[PDB]
């Protein structure tokens, strides 16, 4: 079967990695007290 | 302190699951030509 032409490469640059990891870790720092309760 | 028994795993997966999602996407970006 011939390849699907709708496929596209995905990217996430380093600044987006740093921004996302900042967002995840700060959300975890915020919510962990409530998860522990 | 008598904390929620599921709180540790809830926190650990809340970090690790989207963190590794970003790590996967970042590293496969760097390996592109």
């Amino acid at each position: 079967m011939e390849p699907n032409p709708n496929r596209q490469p995905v990217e996430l640059n380093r600044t987006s990695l740093y921004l996302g990891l900042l967002l995840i870790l700060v959300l975890a720092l915020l919510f962990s007290s409530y998860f522990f309760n | 302190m008598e904390v929620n028994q599921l709180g540790l795993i809830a926190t650990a997966l809340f970090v690790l699951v989207p963190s590794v999602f970003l790590i996967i996407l970042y590293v496969q970006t760097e390996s592109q030509q």
């Binding site: 380093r14 870790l25 720092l29 962990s32 007290s33 522990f36 | 302190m1 540790l8 650990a12 970090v15």
Partner: peptide, 30 residues
């Protein structure tokens, strides 16, 4: 485990600061 958790996340944030400042993608004039 709670105190360990909160300190762990804090230490990961501080590590992230280190990489975000000293190992950032260098802004390039083009």
């Amino acid at each position: 485990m709670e105190t360990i958790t909160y300190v762990f996340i804090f230490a990961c944030i501080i590590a992230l600061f280190f990489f975000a400042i000293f190992f950032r993608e260098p802004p390039r004039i083009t």
